[PDB]
Swiss-Prot record, chain B:
Probable ubiquitin-protein ligase which is mainly involved pre-mRNA splicing and DNA repair. Core component of the NTC/Nineteen complex which is part of the spliceosome and participates in its assembly, its remodeling and is required for its activity. Together with emb-4, necessary for interaction of rnp-4, a probable exon junction complex component, with mRNAs and spliceosomal snRNAs. Plays a role in nuclear retention of unspliced mRNAs. It is an enzyme of class 2 (transferase). PROSITE patterns: U_BOX, WD_REPEATS_1, WD_REPEATS_2, WD_REPEATS_REGION. Homotetramer. Component of the NTC complex (or PRP19-associated complex) which is associated with the spliceosome. Pathway: Protein modification; protein ubiquitination. Its main location: nucleus. It is found in: Nucleus; Nucleus, Nucleoplasm. One of its GO terms (biological process) is mRNA splicing, via spliceosome. The lineage of its organism: Eukaryota, Metazoa, Ecdysozoa, Nematoda, Chromadorea. Pfam families: Prp19, U-box, WD40_Prp19. This is Pre-mRNA-processing factor 19. It comes from the Eukaryota.
């Protein structure tokens, strides 16, 4: 309820995976 | 999706949008706004609680704690300190709103005053360019002596009012106790002007006659004839014998109760005369006209000492004029709704008062020497203080019916008001004491008896009537 | 503009809301979406040109955004979140106390176990001597 | 009407009842209970956020309201502490009781074996 903004922490981790790595789904 | 409320400026967990604006709001706040005002807070359109679209995406998450906010009592400390700033910010806004409205009034005043300079200079330039485009080859000492006498003798009356003054509780019981009819012909009906001197009275009519009448003897005293057009104003002299009258034929004519002939004619105006006023000593008469000049003249010989335009280089209808009762200054009122105060010693504008929203049909000065009243077609009445040249108080009728006449009482305790109905104000309280509507048409004059013991009014209803308690 | 479109994932310059929507759309997105789909991108309601309304900012009276992070709503919110946590904690503590207190009340055999020992030992003290 | 939440024991502005037990809760607490425990807090049956049924439904001074929050918060925390203190006392009494029981079993075991000797003297 308080630190629910950790969803954006893994999005920042996701961005480091989406940049400098493999293809997104098709 | 991060959103913030247009009302509070904070984040909102429940954003909502009105159908009549693009702005977004926190739901509970805008609903309370709608519940009070029924309107959009920013576009001011009509708004209802069903005209809302819900921005039901994910709301704004919680802010992180401050390090001091990690404990419950320090959150309460933080909440208290936060609240003090919010309260003082709200207090700062209402202070700032007072300051802004104060400065705007001064700014508009300075701009208005600047437009007077522009207008005066623009006319001087037009006259200069017109000349190019068509170029072809003890009186003053007496008044101060008299005014200081007049204003000094007042000072005892200012300290104590007469003990015989009628009470407010008596004036609350005013009723119709005399009525007089047939003073003027029914083919051109209505009393156009009235003045009184005790039971003696002088009346004008549309029938071109001037009739002197006693409303206690129920009889005509004398009749005068010779005016080519309707009578607009009359003055009855303190000697009870001399009578003064003004006609739309641009001439002022002077009469005597003892005489069958014109005592004088004062050819001094180019246009219909609209109002006249009598100097406190009775030696001289002052007049105004549609020609925009004021002119100051001997009642007997018709010679004029001085004459100046109320608005040089322009034509503006002047609708009211009155001496200040010490006699050195007089007020003037015109269709531009400017009231100008003139010094007779310098023969120049002493003060100018933008005020009413419409033409000033009547002006009154108090014999206390400092209350002034002006009355207009816009249906307001305003009280003015000459000691600082400022307004005191305003009174009005919500129907905005024109006011045709005003009169203070002889002591300046009461102000009589006349328009579509008859009213009297006790001026120090500025409260309506009574209102009377017994006339079937517009009122054309208001006067008071001695010690406020009687009230006299006239109307277009073909009647002269007196009220007393 | 600071609103980000829920479909394209990029910042708007023409935000649009409709009564069956909830996520923001661009005007230049939704009109072609109406033409091909005719269908709400998120709720699959029917779309029509009279539903769309466009958002605006900076009108007269609009309050300045509080950026200082602290606010009365957010403090009352987190104080409420503290209270919810403490009551759910207290409830599970109260539940555990009730369970532990209950079984120890049932386990109060000490006086009756002692009488059985007295009965047993007094038998033993006779059994020890009848031999 | 006044409605009391079965979790908090306090009045609620938004009373809710659970069909899995018929007990009345504050909507916000029970949703947080479901979102953590997935169960009815009283009956321990499976419960979910769609199963809640809604029930029907001036200020004084800001320093005064803040002082009520202070005094009230100290009361809630006093309750939380005394529960932890009473819980450990319950656990200490319980472990002693089990120790009395297990020691009594040792005695009853010991004596019942010694009572066999009288049959073989």
């Amino acid at each position: 309820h308080e630190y629910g903004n950790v969803i954006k922490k893994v999005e920042e981790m996701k961005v480091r995976r989406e940049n400098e790595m493999l293809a997104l789904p098709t | 999706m991060s959103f913030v409320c247009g009302i509070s400026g904070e984040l909102t967990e429940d954003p909502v949008v009105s159908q009549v604006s693009g702005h977004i709001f926190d739901r509970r706040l805008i609903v309370k706004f709608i519940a009070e005002n029924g309107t959009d807070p920013i576009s001011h359109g009509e708004l209802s609680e069903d005209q809302l679209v819900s921005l039901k995406s994910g709301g704004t998450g919680s802010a992180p704690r401050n390090v001091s906010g990690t404990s419950i009592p320090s959150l309460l400390k933080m909440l208290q300190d936060e609240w003090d700033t919010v309260m003082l910010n709200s207090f700062s806004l209402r202070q700032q709103l007072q300051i802004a409205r104060q400065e705007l009034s001064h700014s508009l005043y300075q701009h208005d005053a600047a437009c007077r300079v522009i207008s005066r200079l623009s006319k001087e330039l037009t006259a200069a360019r017109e000349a190019l485009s068509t170029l072809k080859p003890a009186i003053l000492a007496k008044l101060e002596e008299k005014s200081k006498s007049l204003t000094a003798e007042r000072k005892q009356r200012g300290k104590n009012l007469p003990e015989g003054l009628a009470k407010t509780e008596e004036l609350a019981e005013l009723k119709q106790t005399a009525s007089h009819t047939g003073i003027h012909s029914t083919g051109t009906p209505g009393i156009t002007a009235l003045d009184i001197k005790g039971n003696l009275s002088l009346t004008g009519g549309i029938d071109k006659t001037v009739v002197l009448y006693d409303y206690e003897k129920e009889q005509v005293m004398q009749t005068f004839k010779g005016h080519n057009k309707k009578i607009n104003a009359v003055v009855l002299h303190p000697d009870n014998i001399t009578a003064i009258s003004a006609s739309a034929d641009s001439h002022i004519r002077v009469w005597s109760a003892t005489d069958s002939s014109s005592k004088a004619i004062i050819d001094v105006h180019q246009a219909p005369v609209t109002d006249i006023s009598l100097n406190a000593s009775g030696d001289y008469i002052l007049s105004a006209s549609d020609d925009s000049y004021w002119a100051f003249s001997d009642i007997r010989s018709g010679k004029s000492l001085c004459k100046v335009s109320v608005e040089p280089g322009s034509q503006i209808a002047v609708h009211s004029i009155e001496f200040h009762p010490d006699g050195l200054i007089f007020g003037t009122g015109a269709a531009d709704a400017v009231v100008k105060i003139w010094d007779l010693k310098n023969q120049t504008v002493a003060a100018a008062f933008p005020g009413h929203t419409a033409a000033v049909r009547s002006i009154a000065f108090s014999e206390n020497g400092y209350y002034l009243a002006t009355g207009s077609e816009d249906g307001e009445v305003k009280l003015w203080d000459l000691r600082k040249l400022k307004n005191l108080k305003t009174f009005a009728n919500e129907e905005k019916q024109p006011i045709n006449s005003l009169s203070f009482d002889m002591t300046g305790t009461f102000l009589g008001i006349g328009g579509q109905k008859v009213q009297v104000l006790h001026v120090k309280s500025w409260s309506e004491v009574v209102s009377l509507s017994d006339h079937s048409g517009p009122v054309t004059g208001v006067r008071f008896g001695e010690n406020a013991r009687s009230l006299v009014t006239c109307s277009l209803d073909k009647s002269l009537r007196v009220f007393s308690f």
